[PDB]
Design a protein around this ligand. Sequence first.
Ligand SMILES: [K+]
Ligand SMILES: [K+]
Ligand SMILES: [K+]
Ligand SMILES: [K+]
Ligand SMILES: [K+]
Lengths: 83, 83, 83, 83, 83
Amino acid sequence: PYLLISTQIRMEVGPTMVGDEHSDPELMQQLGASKRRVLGNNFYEYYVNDPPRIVLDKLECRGFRVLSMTGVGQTLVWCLHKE
Amino acid sequence: PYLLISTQIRMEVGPTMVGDEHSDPELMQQLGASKRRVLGNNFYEYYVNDPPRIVLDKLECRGFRVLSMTGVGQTLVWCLHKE
Amino acid sequence: PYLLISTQIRMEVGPTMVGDEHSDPELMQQLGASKRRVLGNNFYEYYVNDPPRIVLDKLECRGFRVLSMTGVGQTLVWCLHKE
Amino acid sequence: PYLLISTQIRMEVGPTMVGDEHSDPELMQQLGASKRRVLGNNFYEYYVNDPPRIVLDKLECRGFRVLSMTGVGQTLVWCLHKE
Amino acid sequence: PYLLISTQIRMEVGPTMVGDEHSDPELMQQLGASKRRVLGNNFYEYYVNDPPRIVLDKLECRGFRVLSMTGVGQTLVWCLHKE
Ligand SMILES: [K+]
Ligand SMILES: [K+]
Ligand SMILES: [K+]
Ligand SMILES: [K+]
Ligand SMILES: [K+]
């Protein structure tokens, strides 16, 4: 299984987006993530206020490892994987 | 063999492009893809309504693995590979 | 040795720039590549009219594998390697 | 554990940002990094004036390896990992 | 040790930046690099006229391998590593 998380520049602060409407609910909880819908968007998302680095470390503890990272617009995105 | 899939940000929702007009039709069918031609294009494309994460998880079951991910414009691209 | 190939978006269609004037003439021929200059082009380029995926697949048969992929401007670039 | 460092082009000169305010102070101490808040921000950043190459080599000695690199806007970002 | 090399699009031609002013002179010489300070730059840079592909191959000979590639602005950057 894969995981996509992102953050808007600057990377040193949050919030960090950690999931879509169908993300594993137990994982989102383990990260202290909340479900919300930002106005202007027509989809729900999970987020945490922690900067990306903090979230990457937490995910390592749950078995996820970073495969790739890229930028698009002013968004930094990380693709994680787990057997 | 390789596979290129993409999506425009936001990455939490679809649609997700999963093929060119020469794509393996059996795989496109297993992904639940549909063929269409956007206005202004002289070529067809396969796409699904599921967000990128869901599509990666499905491909992982088909034997694919993400080698790389990148951004170009407002588009997110994943290059997958299967032995 | 390394290889660099590219294409402008959309990624679904060609052409695909598969080499520079110093590229292996053998390799360029197995991929059905044609050399040329693009007016203003003080240099040459090898391309094929196939979309990136087709090309990536053919290069695989020749021992080349994708190490990295990135976007720059409206251009997608793949970096392949071979023992 | 993961580490995120960055720099603005040109990549040949500094400064290089080596951490947020929750960064390991011992590690920061070791790179000879300094803390400062830049006009426009509201949070602190650790940084060195050495260019990225020197920083990557210093981090290699500490057991950190580069997992990925990417540009976003005018910023180069490197994601490093350590067992 | 790490290495950072780059080039402006188009990637088919050079020059290719191969180092900063603190770069290993001995390594710079095996590449046949030259030193120069571009106007409007408060720093020196080592370059070669060879397009990226040739430099990548020359560096493979000396024990360097590509870890990541990315684009920032009109520049393509390669991060190479050597045990
Ligand atoms: K942020
Ligand atoms: K989308
Ligand atoms: K194209
Ligand atoms: K800089
Ligand atoms: K160039």
